[PDB]
């Protein structure tokens, strides 16, 4: 979408594989605000909003909290406390046309600045002066939007770049979007420090001969002590035996 009319996609109830985006070299800008770019997988949020737009090279610096300019103030404004990472890459060989690619537009003239994540898509001819335009362009009557002359012969500062901003929103909600989870090899007949989903402790795990119901994740004994767990991956039932100890 055009930067003046950015396409907001809500990401929820899914596994956010941030390691691919971080590890790859396809992006030229990767500015993370409020999160650590190498710890992003461990941060769970209620909503993730993917703001997709194209800006010019010189304006990539403007896709940040606190920036100003024709785009930052009249097209796509970010809040000072924006949380998320801004990812952008050079798209010169994708959007530019020999005769100039003018299909990408941005808003240049507006009565006031946008609110965070405000999408103003009005096409009313902007009245800059005091004379009503009444649908006629002229003195003090300027169209509020203007197109970009994207061409393959333009310098880098005028080449198109594709920018994707992943906005991280945490609401009073379960927080359904998280990164991939770590898993390790199962160790049997030895004392290990284990963590099965949310069940943690120390003990010896052996093959179980117990039969759990299809919806039961772990077993607990008469003293509220965990004595069996279901393996989250292979649906094996494992008994937890406390590590041998005693007086000497």
């Amino acid at each position, epitope marked *: 979408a055009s930067v003046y009319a950015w396409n907001r996609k809500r990401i929820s109830n899914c596994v956010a594989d941030y390691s691919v985006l971080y590890n790859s070299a396809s992006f030229s800008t990767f500015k993370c605000y409020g999160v650590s770019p190498t710890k992003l997988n461990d941060l769970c949020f209620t909503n993730v909003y993917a703001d997709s737009f194209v800006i010019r090279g010189d304006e990539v610096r403007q896709i940040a909290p606190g920036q100003t*300019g024709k785009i930052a103030d009249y097209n796509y404004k970010l809040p000072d406390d924006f949380t998320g990472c801004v990812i952008a890459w050079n798209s010169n060989n994708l959007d530019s046309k020999v005769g100039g690619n003018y299909n990408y537009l941005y808003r240049l003239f507006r009565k006031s600045n946008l609110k965070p994540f405000e999408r103003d898509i009005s096409t009313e001819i902007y009245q800059a002066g*005091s004379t009503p335009c009444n649908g006629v362009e002229g003195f003090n009557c300027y169209f509020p939007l203007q197109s970009y002359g994207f061409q393959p012969t333009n310098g880098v500062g*005028y080449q198109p770049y594709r920018v994707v901003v992943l906005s991280f929103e945490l609401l009073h909600a379960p927080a359904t979007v998280c990164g991939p989870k770590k898993s390790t090899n199962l160790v049997k007949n030895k004392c290990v420090n284990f963590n099965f989903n949310g069940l943690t402790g120390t003990g010896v795990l052996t093959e179980s001969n117990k039969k759990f119901l299809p919806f039961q994740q772990f077993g607990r004994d008469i003293a509220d002590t965990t004595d069996a767990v279901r393996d989250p991956q292979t649906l094996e039932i494992l008994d937890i035996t406390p590590c041998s100890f005693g007086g000497v």
Partner: antibody, heavy 118, light 108 residues
């Protein structure tokens, strides 16, 4: 449209000027505005860049000294220079309405304000 | 500041141009070369905007082309309309400055 600058002239060293940059036709409140200074034999550098939302950018020429503004009621801009450096001896320019696939950057210029700042 | 020639001299009738070499963020000054025909003693008047493009009221002389870190501000059919001071401008480094080049006082 007509942009007549006022307030330029001779002012003693070190002071501030509340000059006004009148504009006709286009009520000067909501166009991307720029103000520049250009001494004789010198070039015009953007002293300030008054974004129509309100943001002001003073890249090179002005340094914490000059304030670009507009009087909303009269549709005429005001060109504040205050705490002018001995380096501020120059003339003013305050017009930005680009057009009449394009670029449209800093097209017009008004009558200008000529100031002698010793 | 882009390197602009100090001056341009000639009598009217010979095809001429005002080349202006300046990276100005590359892109031929971002096709953002604001060429202005500043009259001597009068405030600058823009001649051509969007260097390749001719703004309203531009003379038949008006022309403009930018290559790499260089520009070619051309006036065709040298006539009385050409004798003026010329100024070119572009964003400072890579900003939205609209900074100005060396300035070309074309004097006949």
């Amino acid at each position: 449209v007509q942009l007549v600058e006022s307030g330029g002239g001779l002012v003693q060293p070190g002071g501030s000027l509340r000059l006004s940059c009148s504009v006709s036709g286009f009520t000067v409140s909501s166009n991307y505005m720029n103000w520049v200074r250009q001494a004789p034999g010198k070039g015009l550098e953007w002293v300030s860049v008054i974004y129509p939302g309100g943001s002001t950018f003073y890249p090179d020429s002005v340094k914490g000294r000059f304030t670009i503004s507009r009087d909303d009621s009269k549709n005429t801009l005001y060109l504040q220079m205050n705490s002018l450096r001995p380096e501020d001896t120059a003339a003013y320019y305050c017009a930005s309405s680009r057009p009449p696939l394009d670029l449209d950057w800093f097209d017009p210029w008004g009558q200008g304000t000529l100031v002698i700042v010793s | 500041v882009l390197t602009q020639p100090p001056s341009v001299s000639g009598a009217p009738g010979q095809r001429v141009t005002i080349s202006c070499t300046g990276s100005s963020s590359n892109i031929g000054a971002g096709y953002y070369v604001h060429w202005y025909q500043q009259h001597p003693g009068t405030a600058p008047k823009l001649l051509i905007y969007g260097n390749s493009n001719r703004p309203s009221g531009v003379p038949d002389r008006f022309s403009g082309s930018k290559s790499g870190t260089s520009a070619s501000l051309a006036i065709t059919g040298l006539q009385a309309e050409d004798e003026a001071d010329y100024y070119c401008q572009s964003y400072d480094s890579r900003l939205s400055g609209w900074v100005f080049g060396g300035g070309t006082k074309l004097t006949v």
